[PDB]
Design a protein around this ligand. Structure first.
Ligand SMILES: O=C(O)c1ccccc1O[C@H]1CN[C@H](C(=O)O)C1
Ligand SMILES: O=C(O)c1ccccc1O[C@H]1CN[C@H](C(=O)O)C1
Ligand SMILES: [Cl-]
Ligand SMILES: [Cl-]
Lengths: 251, 253
């Protein structure tokens, strides 16, 4: 029996709506749940789902200590990590990512019927406020980026004691829905919001490219099996059936 | 010093146009050449480029024997494989792919100003001929697919002794440019053709999703370092600079 760490995030992992209390893996539903069931079908294993204790994805502090699911894997406290976990330079040095089961990039969430079309328009303007979720991967991108426009936008974001940032995605969506605010976030979620908020839309394309990968500890025997299984589901179109299932309109 | 097997394909690996003979790595230019230089910058190694002898990518025959670059890596005849090599189920069981340095999918190459808009439009019709390169990965997808539309299209393609298929991509491009033909192929090439053939365009989106990865033999010490370096170039935007360099054309009206 394997242990699978994960985090709550629509529509990947959500508390299932039921009248009676639920127990174990039956407590959760979502894209990553279906993906985990298919993984258990291919590789043939039993799995127990455990939300990450501190509710964090995975970053390292100044002394080099990791948190969240990444740390769960490093300490051999979880066997798998099935969640929208971004494949980054620093994360892959400490854990093993499978081949990406979803490809995406940073984009812009804003209102419809406006003249804004790119991040350069946001950079050339200070009336509309723009920012991202604190400590998320997008913030890390703008922090580390050396592209001119993105260093300017990071200056605006960090400015005023980082007042332009939000603690979580839903607070950012609300800030867009109530003020003159643009929220830079991962595009797979922008699809969800836009498909469920017909007055919001994505502005521009993808600023970069990245992917969600299943995480395993370094030296795990299930590494190759997980990668091969992910590719097997990719070529069968199953992953796209799942995404289309959990994501589907707007005029 | 490492040995890197590869294959010729615009704009990944092309013979540079010169008046005088060229020698060694100076013979070649392209996207994968720039990527290989940056990789050598990160990991710090010397490399020698070797075109794959049989000029094949990598497939297995009826008895289970591999050819092309894949076989080059399996037999420890190459250290790296830097080429538009698709990360497939059957290939990863025998070699190690890095994280993809380019993501793409199967799409349709056709003419502009026509009513065709999706693979469903092609599937409902037998007047317009459509197909793909024989034994390639694009053909393999339609071979294995269990979706209704793609099983229908596979019937049309295989029909008439596979008369709808072509031997290579360039013959397919010519077939589109001269007859009423649609060529299903990897989208990264459709972008190149469309940028250099302003009367051709891509029809629809991506039928599937896949990626090009640097190939190494199983158990190579350069594996993790190559993957990490590829991700480092992804986060620096270098891969997009290279693609935009080798893909932008002179524009279309
Ligand atoms: O970071 C965001 O902007 C974001 C906005 C909405 C929803 C999810 C977001 O990212 C999460 C999931 N991937 C990031 C990681 O792998 O660390 C963190
Ligand atoms: O097959 C195609 O659609 C194609 C069209 C133009 C150029 C190259 C093409 O395929 C090569 C590259 N990817 C395939 C592989 O890595 O297995 C073989
Ligand atoms: Cl994908
Ligand atoms: Cl990429």
């Amino acid at each position: 029996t394997l242990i699978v760490t994960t985090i709550l995030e629509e529509p990947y992992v959500m508390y299932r709506k039921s009248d009676k209390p639920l127990y174990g893996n039956d407590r959760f539903e979502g894209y990553c749940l279906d993906l985990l069931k298919e993984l258990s079908n291919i590789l043939g294993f039993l799995y127990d789902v455990k939300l990450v204790p501190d509710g964090k994805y995975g970053a390292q502090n100044d002394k080099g200590e990791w948190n969240g699911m990444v740390k769960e894997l490093i300490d051999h406290r979880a066997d798998l990590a099935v969640a929208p976990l971004t494949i980054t330079y620093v994360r892959e040095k400490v854990i093993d990512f499978s081949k990406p089961f979803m490809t995406l990039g940073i984009s812009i969430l804003y209102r419809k019927g406006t003249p804004i079309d790119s991040a350069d328009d946001l950079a050339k303007q200070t009336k509309i406020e723009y920012g991202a979720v604190r400590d998320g991967s997008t913030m890390t991108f703008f922090k580390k980026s050396k592209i001119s426009t993105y260093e300017k936008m990071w200056a605006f974001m960090s400015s005023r004691q980082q007042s332009a940032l939000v603690k979580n995605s839903d607070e950012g969506i609300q800030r867009v829905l109530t003020t003159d605010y643009a929220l830079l976030m991962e595009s797979t979620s922008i699809e969800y919001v836009t498909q469920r908020n017909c007055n919001l839309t994505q502005i521009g394309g993808l600023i970069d490219s990245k992917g969600y990968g299943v995480g395993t500890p370094i030296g795990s025997p299930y590494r190759d099996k997980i990668t091969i299984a992910i590719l097997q589901l990719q070529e069968e179109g199953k992953l796209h059936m799942m995404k289309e299932k959990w994501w589907r309109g707007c005029p």
